[PDB]
RNA sequence: GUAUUCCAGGGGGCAUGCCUGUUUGAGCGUCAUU
RNA sequence: AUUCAAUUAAGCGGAGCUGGAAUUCAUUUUCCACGUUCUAGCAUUCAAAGUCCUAUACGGGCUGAUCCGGGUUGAAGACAU
RNA sequence: UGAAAAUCCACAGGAAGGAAUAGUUUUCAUGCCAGGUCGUACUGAUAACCGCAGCAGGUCUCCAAGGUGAACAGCCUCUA
RNA sequence: GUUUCAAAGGCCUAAUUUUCUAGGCCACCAUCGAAAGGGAAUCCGGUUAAUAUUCCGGAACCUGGAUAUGGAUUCUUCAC
């Protein structure tokens, strides 16, 4: 029977995780998503090129 | 005479385990699809001291493939693990310290612990402090690897059975002497009621076979047969050798 | 088109929660369901004797339909039609006094096991129809051997329920004919000659051969694979 | 043929049409009259020398109450019999094994005037 | 007492095993019909 | 049959795709692989595609997730009990 | 390496629901009604308990002043 | 023996506005066990031959019900 302004602070994860915890996991969540899109860039370029490279072995 | 201490431990009134500060049954994950074929990610969050156990435990968080949920499993920590570390369990999992592999996808001369006797046993062989199982041999016909247990006696185990890589943590526990008797008390205080053991020869002839007589002597041979009965078996049971052994065990 | 976006899920072992599949194969049934399904299998795997094996030789779909078209004629009275007949009886007896010829002579199919066995024993029954799924087989197993000795046409047929439907019953077990009208005698003898080819003529043949000894799917592919590698290497 | 599609690997009891009661004869025959009446709850007015001192000063009249009597029931009983609006009820069980109910009335009704009407004073 | 849901008061009900029937059902255990 | 173990009885056994290829050369002839490994994030109410309609509001069928046998799976076995 | 569960709260998540001639909020300010049942005296010991009894025995706890002195030691006072 | 080789259920919203029917989700499981463990919320002053955090006077607080006034929020909106 207390107001929830006293229970919580106004931020993302609020009254559960600390501010420096939210600091890091935003930086992680962002930076991993940048690395995950490069997994396409490496494979799409190489695996498509592998079909050209493997055909040279037959000729 | 009376029922001897030997005989009356199996009743289980006082002679029972003290499971107050015991964390949980230290076991492996269940089998099937995910770890049969591929592998799964797991994150070690805590490394805990279990009460009355020479082994620091580890609690790893895995996902449920069929639900939006999380199931924690209590692993025995091998010396090398740390909190905030990834673990890889399955057939296709790689060979590192902590990772759980089946015996078939492992080369000869490797080191492991918490090994299953069957597949789906959830652990049995080599769970104590500073112990580890070594893989020797292999077979194509009959999925059955050759394995050496830490006592010395070798054993044939199925190839699909599991084993966590590395030596079990908390090693060199036996090296320090206990000194004062109060240190020994606190060891058995968090296990069973098996300590202050009186010598059977000091007792009366009613309470124990060796007991009785004007001088404290046994009287007859302490080497007792395998084909005996409960009450008689107090001494060396089915002994091949006696006396001081030299070097080779 | 513009604001809409595609999003593939990927169910590659570790990635994503798996979708809803039909797991009808992996359901834990009740104990009574597991009993009746395993009782089917236990009889098939063991070698069944020739006396039990002959009930598998059932009447085919095309021939059977003609038989029950015949036997739905010469069916017994419904409870209302018996009450109709007894009112006619009471009228003629009071004013007339005539039993034995009045309310004609009924032509009707014979049923009941103890009732039918006596007709076969005195060479009276022309056609007989035996059920394939009686609870103890001991009840109905000896009837094929009895009809052989006396030279009576007989035919095993599916559904003890279907024999019950033509006689106002839940289950009948057996159903035989004796008396029949002269108009429908031509069609009856046509069925007997068709029946005797399968059942009565092949009694000495059916007595010899054993049934059973049929393995499950995992056992079949194990034997076929093992036979291929060693012999045809 | 064509099986019922089912996602779960469990098999539970299918809920069925649960039918209600509809008897051919009554078990009781005659419904019983009121077990606890207005007159049966409040039995006697207590006339000890201490109780006279409370009636004058405290504006509170005291009763000997039967066992199996709630403070809801005693509030209803005094309200019905003597036609008075009750403020509060306090109850205790005596050492001899009989319940006693202290009852305080509102400021409108004087406890001394109603006391001389009932019998005692 | 402002009341399908909250509070109190007066009255009537809710155990287990087994039998006979009634109504809903479960199972490619199995039969005929589209 | 009897015995032992595990799960809320999910992915058993065999064929088929695309495989990528295989070298007697593309094959009704076999081997051979299957979507995640710098980081203590995140993953749930079933979406795109085509097909029609509910008259396009809000949503129905077929795919996305292949098909066929309903033996839950693995020991052990005419020994043991 | 020094209990468990009832119980209460917070966050992620976006289900469903809403306006202007009117509508949402009862985790805030005020205001209204109700709160059952049983225990409640006194003793707790050189006299209310157990020990044949008003028996130098035995029986779990809390509060705790001044001076001397290391001191909850011994010896002497105040309140009761 | 107490979760097992059992077909082991009780929690929310409408539909219907006869108050009886429809939506749904979710699922190895009785019940007893502490007046020193856990635990919703009360204090001062007065009064009796003998009772009080329990009666009287004065000032508070919690849980469960009902509910309407003020304030806040709203042209792009669930505050800055």
Short mmCIF file of N, CA and C in Angstrom, two decimals, chain D:
data_model
loop_
_atom_site.label_atom_id
_atom_site.label_comp_id
_atom_site.label_asym_id
_atom_site.label_seq_id
_atom_site.Cartn_x
_atom_site.Cartn_y
_atom_site.Cartn_z
N UNK D 1 -11.18 -43.46 -39.71
CA UNK D 1 -9.86 -43.10 -40.31
C UNK D 1 -9.62 -41.59 -40.27
N UNK D 2 -8.37 -41.19 -40.54
CA UNK D 2 -7.89 -39.82 -40.36
C UNK D 2 -7.93 -39.43 -38.88
N UNK D 3 -6.81 -39.64 -38.20
CA UNK D 3 -6.72 -39.49 -36.73
C UNK D 3 -6.96 -38.07 -36.23
N UNK D 4 -7.34 -37.97 -34.96
CA UNK D 4 -7.47 -36.69 -34.27
C UNK D 4 -6.07 -36.15 -33.98
N UNK D 5 -5.75 -34.99 -34.55
CA UNK D 5 -4.46 -34.33 -34.30
C UNK D 5 -4.37 -33.90 -32.83
N UNK D 6 -3.23 -34.20 -32.20
CA UNK D 6 -3.01 -33.89 -30.78
C UNK D 6 -1.53 -33.57 -30.53
N UNK D 7 -1.28 -32.35 -30.05
CA UNK D 7 0.08 -31.83 -29.89
C UNK D 7 0.79 -32.38 -28.66
N UNK D 8 0.07 -32.41 -27.53
CA UNK D 8 0.65 -32.84 -26.25
C UNK D 8 0.92 -34.34 -26.20
N UNK D 9 1.92 -34.72 -25.41
CA UNK D 9 2.30 -36.13 -25.20
C UNK D 9 1.59 -36.78 -24.00
N UNK D 10 0.70 -36.03 -23.33
CA UNK D 10 -0.08 -36.55 -22.20
C UNK D 10 -1.48 -36.98 -22.64
N UNK D 11 -2.15 -37.73 -21.76
CA UNK D 11 -3.54 -38.13 -21.95
C UNK D 11 -4.28 -37.97 -20.62
N UNK D 12 -5.20 -37.00 -20.58
CA UNK D 12 -5.97 -36.68 -19.36
C UNK D 12 -7.41 -37.17 -19.46
N UNK D 13 -8.09 -37.17 -18.32
CA UNK D 13 -9.47 -37.65 -18.22
C UNK D 13 -10.40 -36.63 -18.89
N UNK D 14 -11.17 -37.05 -19.91
CA UNK D 14 -12.10 -36.12 -20.56
C UNK D 14 -13.31 -35.81 -19.68
N UNK D 15 -13.47 -34.54 -19.32
CA UNK D 15 -14.62 -34.09 -18.52
C UNK D 15 -15.96 -34.42 -19.19
N UNK D 16 -16.90 -34.93 -18.40
CA UNK D 16 -18.18 -35.43 -18.90
C UNK D 16 -19.36 -34.68 -18.29
N UNK D 17 -20.57 -34.99 -18.78
CA UNK D 17 -21.80 -34.36 -18.29
C UNK D 17 -22.14 -34.87 -16.89
N UNK D 18 -21.79 -34.07 -15.88
CA UNK D 18 -22.07 -34.39 -14.48
C UNK D 18 -23.49 -33.95 -14.12
N UNK D 19 -24.35 -34.91 -13.81
CA UNK D 19 -25.78 -34.66 -13.60
C UNK D 19 -26.09 -34.35 -12.13
N UNK D 20 -27.05 -33.45 -11.92
CA UNK D 20 -27.44 -32.99 -10.57
C UNK D 20 -28.44 -33.93 -9.91
N UNK D 21 -28.71 -33.69 -8.63
CA UNK D 21 -29.65 -34.51 -7.85
C UNK D 21 -31.11 -34.20 -8.21
N UNK D 22 -31.96 -35.22 -8.06
CA UNK D 22 -33.40 -35.10 -8.29
C UNK D 22 -34.11 -36.30 -7.65
N UNK D 23 -34.27 -36.27 -6.31
CA UNK D 23 -34.71 -37.45 -5.56
C UNK D 23 -36.20 -37.76 -5.67
N UNK D 24 -36.55 -39.01 -5.36
CA UNK D 24 -37.94 -39.48 -5.36
C UNK D 24 -38.64 -39.30 -4.00
N UNK D 25 -37.86 -39.18 -2.93
CA UNK D 25 -38.40 -38.88 -1.59
C UNK D 25 -37.41 -38.08 -0.74
N UNK D 26 -37.95 -37.26 0.16
CA UNK D 26 -37.13 -36.45 1.07
C UNK D 26 -36.63 -37.31 2.23
N UNK D 27 -35.37 -37.10 2.62
CA UNK D 27 -34.77 -37.82 3.75
C UNK D 27 -35.25 -37.30 5.11
N UNK D 28 -35.50 -35.99 5.19
CA UNK D 28 -35.85 -35.33 6.45
C UNK D 28 -37.35 -35.37 6.79
N UNK D 29 -38.20 -35.39 5.77
CA UNK D 29 -39.67 -35.41 5.92
C UNK D 29 -40.24 -34.07 6.41
N UNK D 30 -39.93 -33.69 7.65
CA UNK D 30 -40.32 -32.40 8.22
C UNK D 30 -39.06 -31.56 8.41
N UNK D 31 -38.99 -30.35 7.80
CA UNK D 31 -37.90 -29.42 8.13
C UNK D 31 -37.97 -28.97 9.58
N UNK D 32 -36.83 -29.01 10.27
CA UNK D 32 -36.77 -28.69 11.70
C UNK D 32 -36.94 -27.19 11.93
N UNK D 33 -37.61 -26.83 13.03
CA UNK D 33 -37.79 -25.43 13.42
C UNK D 33 -36.46 -24.80 13.88
N UNK D 34 -36.48 -23.50 14.15
CA UNK D 34 -35.27 -22.74 14.51
C UNK D 34 -34.61 -23.32 15.77
N UNK D 35 -33.38 -23.83 15.61
CA UNK D 35 -32.60 -24.37 16.74
C UNK D 35 -32.28 -23.31 17.79
N UNK D 36 -31.80 -22.15 17.33
CA UNK D 36 -31.43 -21.04 18.21
C UNK D 36 -32.37 -19.84 17.97
N UNK D 37 -33.29 -19.62 18.91
CA UNK D 37 -34.31 -18.56 18.81
C UNK D 37 -33.82 -17.27 19.47
N UNK D 38 -34.65 -16.23 19.43
CA UNK D 38 -34.37 -14.97 20.12
C UNK D 38 -34.39 -15.12 21.65
N UNK D 39 -35.36 -15.87 22.16
CA UNK D 39 -35.51 -16.10 23.60
C UNK D 39 -34.47 -17.08 24.17
N UNK D 40 -34.03 -18.03 23.35
CA UNK D 40 -33.07 -19.06 23.79
C UNK D 40 -31.63 -18.55 23.93
N UNK D 41 -31.25 -17.55 23.14
CA UNK D 41 -29.90 -16.98 23.18
C UNK D 41 -29.66 -16.24 24.49
N UNK D 42 -30.50 -15.24 24.77
CA UNK D 42 -30.40 -14.43 25.99
C UNK D 42 -31.38 -14.98 27.04
N UNK D 43 -30.83 -15.53 28.12
CA UNK D 43 -31.59 -16.31 29.10
C UNK D 43 -32.05 -15.48 30.29
N UNK D 44 -31.09 -14.93 31.03
CA UNK D 44 -31.36 -14.18 32.27
C UNK D 44 -30.60 -12.85 32.28
N UNK D 45 -31.14 -11.84 33.00
CA UNK D 45 -30.36 -10.64 33.32
C UNK D 45 -29.61 -10.82 34.64
N UNK D 46 -28.31 -10.55 34.63
CA UNK D 46 -27.47 -10.73 35.82
C UNK D 46 -27.70 -9.58 36.81
N UNK D 47 -27.86 -9.93 38.09
CA UNK D 47 -28.23 -8.97 39.14
C UNK D 47 -27.23 -8.98 40.31
N UNK D 48 -25.94 -9.11 40.00
CA UNK D 48 -24.89 -9.00 41.01
C UNK D 48 -24.65 -7.52 41.32
N UNK D 49 -24.08 -7.25 42.50
CA UNK D 49 -23.86 -5.86 42.96
C UNK D 49 -22.88 -5.06 42.09
N UNK D 50 -21.99 -5.76 41.38
CA UNK D 50 -21.10 -5.13 40.40
C UNK D 50 -21.84 -4.67 39.14
N UNK D 51 -22.82 -5.46 38.70
CA UNK D 51 -23.60 -5.16 37.49
C UNK D 51 -24.49 -3.91 37.62
N UNK D 52 -25.02 -3.67 38.82
CA UNK D 52 -25.76 -2.42 39.11
C UNK D 52 -24.88 -1.17 38.96
N UNK D 53 -23.60 -1.29 39.31
CA UNK D 53 -22.65 -0.18 39.20
C UNK D 53 -22.32 0.18 37.74
N UNK D 54 -22.31 -0.83 36.87
CA UNK D 54 -22.09 -0.62 35.43
C UNK D 54 -23.30 -0.02 34.71
N UNK D 55 -24.51 -0.42 35.11
CA UNK D 55 -25.76 0.05 34.50
C UNK D 55 -25.96 1.56 34.71
N UNK D 56 -25.62 2.05 35.90
CA UNK D 56 -25.75 3.48 36.22
C UNK D 56 -24.68 4.32 35.52
N UNK D 57 -23.42 3.92 35.66
CA UNK D 57 -22.28 4.70 35.17
C UNK D 57 -22.00 4.49 33.69
N UNK D 58 -21.71 3.25 33.32
CA UNK D 58 -21.22 2.92 31.97
C UNK D 58 -22.23 2.92 30.83
N UNK D 59 -23.53 2.97 31.15
CA UNK D 59 -24.61 2.86 30.15
C UNK D 59 -24.57 1.48 29.47
N UNK D 60 -24.39 0.44 30.29
CA UNK D 60 -24.21 -0.94 29.82
C UNK D 60 -25.01 -1.91 30.68
N UNK D 61 -25.86 -2.72 30.05
CA UNK D 61 -26.62 -3.78 30.73
C UNK D 61 -26.01 -5.15 30.44
N UNK D 62 -26.01 -6.02 31.44
CA UNK D 62 -25.32 -7.32 31.39
C UNK D 62 -26.35 -8.46 31.37
N UNK D 63 -26.00 -9.55 30.68
CA UNK D 63 -26.88 -10.72 30.54
C UNK D 63 -26.12 -12.03 30.76
N UNK D 64 -26.87 -13.06 31.16
CA UNK D 64 -26.40 -14.45 31.13
C UNK D 64 -26.82 -15.03 29.78
N UNK D 65 -25.83 -15.36 28.95
CA UNK D 65 -26.06 -15.81 27.57
C UNK D 65 -25.75 -17.30 27.45
N UNK D 66 -26.52 -17.99 26.61
CA UNK D 66 -26.32 -19.42 26.35
C UNK D 66 -25.07 -19.64 25.49
N UNK D 67 -24.43 -20.79 25.66
CA UNK D 67 -23.31 -21.20 24.81
C UNK D 67 -23.81 -21.49 23.39
N UNK D 68 -22.90 -21.40 22.42
CA UNK D 68 -23.23 -21.39 20.98
C UNK D 68 -23.96 -20.09 20.61
N UNK D 69 -23.36 -18.96 20.98
CA UNK D 69 -23.93 -17.63 20.74
C UNK D 69 -22.85 -16.64 20.29
N UNK D 70 -22.92 -16.24 19.03
CA UNK D 70 -21.98 -15.27 18.46
C UNK D 70 -22.37 -13.85 18.86
N UNK D 71 -21.43 -12.92 18.70
CA UNK D 71 -21.67 -11.49 18.95
C UNK D 71 -22.57 -10.85 17.88
N UNK D 72 -22.68 -11.49 16.72
CA UNK D 72 -23.70 -11.14 15.72
C UNK D 72 -25.11 -11.48 16.22
N UNK D 73 -25.26 -12.68 16.77
CA UNK D 73 -26.56 -13.19 17.24
C UNK D 73 -27.10 -12.46 18.47
N UNK D 74 -26.20 -12.09 19.39
CA UNK D 74 -26.58 -11.37 20.62
C UNK D 74 -27.00 -9.92 20.29
N UNK D 75 -26.33 -9.31 19.31
CA UNK D 75 -26.70 -7.98 18.81
C UNK D 75 -28.09 -7.97 18.17
N UNK D 76 -28.43 -9.05 17.47
CA UNK D 76 -29.75 -9.22 16.86
C UNK D 76 -30.85 -9.51 17.90
N UNK D 77 -30.51 -10.28 18.93
CA UNK D 77 -31.47 -10.71 19.96
C UNK D 77 -31.95 -9.56 20.85
N UNK D 78 -31.02 -8.74 21.33
CA UNK D 78 -31.34 -7.59 22.19
C UNK D 78 -32.09 -6.51 21.39
N UNK D 79 -31.72 -6.35 20.12
CA UNK D 79 -32.40 -5.44 19.20
C UNK D 79 -33.87 -5.81 18.95
N UNK D 80 -34.16 -7.11 18.88
CA UNK D 80 -35.51 -7.61 18.60
C UNK D 80 -36.42 -7.58 19.83
N UNK D 81 -35.91 -8.04 20.98
CA UNK D 81 -36.71 -8.17 22.20
C UNK D 81 -37.09 -6.82 22.81
N UNK D 82 -36.09 -6.06 23.24
CA UNK D 82 -36.30 -4.82 24.01
C UNK D 82 -36.37 -3.54 23.17
N UNK D 83 -36.22 -3.66 21.85
CA UNK D 83 -36.36 -2.55 20.90
C UNK D 83 -35.33 -1.43 21.15
N UNK D 84 -34.05 -1.82 21.16
CA UNK D 84 -32.94 -0.90 21.46
C UNK D 84 -31.82 -1.04 20.43
N UNK D 85 -31.19 0.08 20.08
CA UNK D 85 -30.05 0.10 19.16
C UNK D 85 -28.75 -0.09 19.94
N UNK D 86 -28.06 -1.19 19.67
CA UNK D 86 -26.86 -1.58 20.42
C UNK D 86 -25.60 -0.98 19.78
N UNK D 87 -24.65 -0.56 20.63
CA UNK D 87 -23.40 0.05 20.18
C UNK D 87 -22.32 -1.02 19.97
N UNK D 88 -22.07 -1.81 21.00
CA UNK D 88 -21.02 -2.84 20.98
C UNK D 88 -21.33 -4.01 21.92
N UNK D 89 -20.69 -5.15 21.65
CA UNK D 89 -20.84 -6.37 22.45
C UNK D 89 -19.46 -6.90 22.83
N UNK D 90 -19.31 -7.31 24.09
CA UNK D 90 -18.10 -7.98 24.59
C UNK D 90 -18.52 -9.21 25.38
N UNK D 91 -17.87 -10.35 25.13
CA UNK D 91 -18.27 -11.63 25.71
C UNK D 91 -17.11 -12.37 26.40
N UNK D 92 -17.45 -13.10 27.46
CA UNK D 92 -16.50 -13.97 28.17
C UNK D 92 -17.20 -15.22 28.69
N UNK D 93 -16.44 -16.30 28.83
CA UNK D 93 -16.93 -17.55 29.43
C UNK D 93 -16.48 -17.57 30.89
N UNK D 94 -17.43 -17.71 31.81
CA UNK D 94 -17.14 -17.74 33.25
C UNK D 94 -16.42 -19.03 33.67
N UNK D 95 -15.79 -19.04 34.87
CA UNK D 95 -15.16 -20.27 35.37
C UNK D 95 -16.11 -21.47 35.58
N UNK D 96 -17.36 -21.20 35.95
CA UNK D 96 -18.37 -22.27 36.12
C UNK D 96 -18.90 -22.86 34.80
N UNK D 97 -18.59 -22.24 33.67
CA UNK D 97 -18.94 -22.77 32.34
C UNK D 97 -20.24 -22.22 31.79
N UNK D 98 -20.39 -20.89 31.86
CA UNK D 98 -21.56 -20.19 31.32
C UNK D 98 -21.11 -18.83 30.76
N UNK D 99 -21.62 -18.49 29.57
CA UNK D 99 -21.19 -17.28 28.86
C UNK D 99 -21.86 -16.03 29.44
N UNK D 100 -21.10 -14.94 29.49
CA UNK D 100 -21.57 -13.63 29.96
C UNK D 100 -21.29 -12.60 28.88
N UNK D 101 -22.31 -11.80 28.54
CA UNK D 101 -22.20 -10.79 27.47
C UNK D 101 -22.44 -9.37 28.00
N UNK D 102 -21.37 -8.57 28.03
CA UNK D 102 -21.48 -7.14 28.32
C UNK D 102 -21.96 -6.42 27.06
N UNK D 103 -23.04 -5.65 27.18
CA UNK D 103 -23.67 -4.97 26.04
C UNK D 103 -23.81 -3.48 26.35
N UNK D 104 -23.19 -2.63 25.52
CA UNK D 104 -23.28 -1.18 25.66
C UNK D 104 -24.24 -0.60 24.62
N UNK D 105 -25.17 0.24 25.08
CA UNK D 105 -26.17 0.87 24.23
C UNK D 105 -25.69 2.23 23.73
N UNK D 106 -26.41 2.80 22.77
CA UNK D 106 -26.10 4.12 22.22
C UNK D 106 -26.55 5.23 23.18
N UNK D 107 -26.15 6.47 22.87
CA UNK D 107 -26.45 7.63 23.72
C UNK D 107 -27.93 8.05 23.76
N UNK D 108 -28.73 7.60 22.78
CA UNK D 108 -30.17 7.90 22.74
C UNK D 108 -30.94 7.23 23.87
N UNK D 109 -30.61 5.96 24.15
CA UNK D 109 -31.34 5.14 25.12
C UNK D 109 -30.57 5.06 26.44
N UNK D 110 -31.25 5.36 27.55
CA UNK D 110 -30.66 5.26 28.88
C UNK D 110 -30.78 3.82 29.39
N UNK D 111 -29.67 3.28 29.90
CA UNK D 111 -29.64 1.91 30.43
C UNK D 111 -30.42 1.75 31.74
N UNK D 112 -30.50 2.83 32.53
CA UNK D 112 -31.20 2.82 33.82
C UNK D 112 -32.72 2.77 33.65
N UNK D 113 -33.25 3.47 32.65
CA UNK D 113 -34.70 3.49 32.38
C UNK D 113 -35.23 2.14 31.86
N UNK D 114 -34.50 1.53 30.93
CA UNK D 114 -34.83 0.19 30.42
C UNK D 114 -34.66 -0.91 31.49
N UNK D 115 -33.74 -0.70 32.44
CA UNK D 115 -33.50 -1.65 33.53
C UNK D 115 -34.70 -1.82 34.45
N UNK D 116 -35.31 -0.71 34.87
CA UNK D 116 -36.53 -0.77 35.71
C UNK D 116 -37.77 -1.33 34.99
N UNK D 117 -37.78 -1.26 33.66
CA UNK D 117 -38.87 -1.84 32.85
C UNK D 117 -38.83 -3.37 32.82
N UNK D 118 -37.63 -3.94 32.63
CA UNK D 118 -37.48 -5.40 32.48
C UNK D 118 -37.78 -6.19 33.77
N UNK D 119 -37.47 -5.61 34.93
CA UNK D 119 -37.77 -6.25 36.22
C UNK D 119 -36.86 -5.78 37.35
N UNK D 120 -35.57 -6.10 37.23
CA UNK D 120 -34.56 -5.74 38.24
C UNK D 120 -34.22 -4.24 38.21
N UNK D 121 -33.22 -3.83 38.99
CA UNK D 121 -32.69 -2.46 38.91
C UNK D 121 -31.20 -2.44 39.26
#
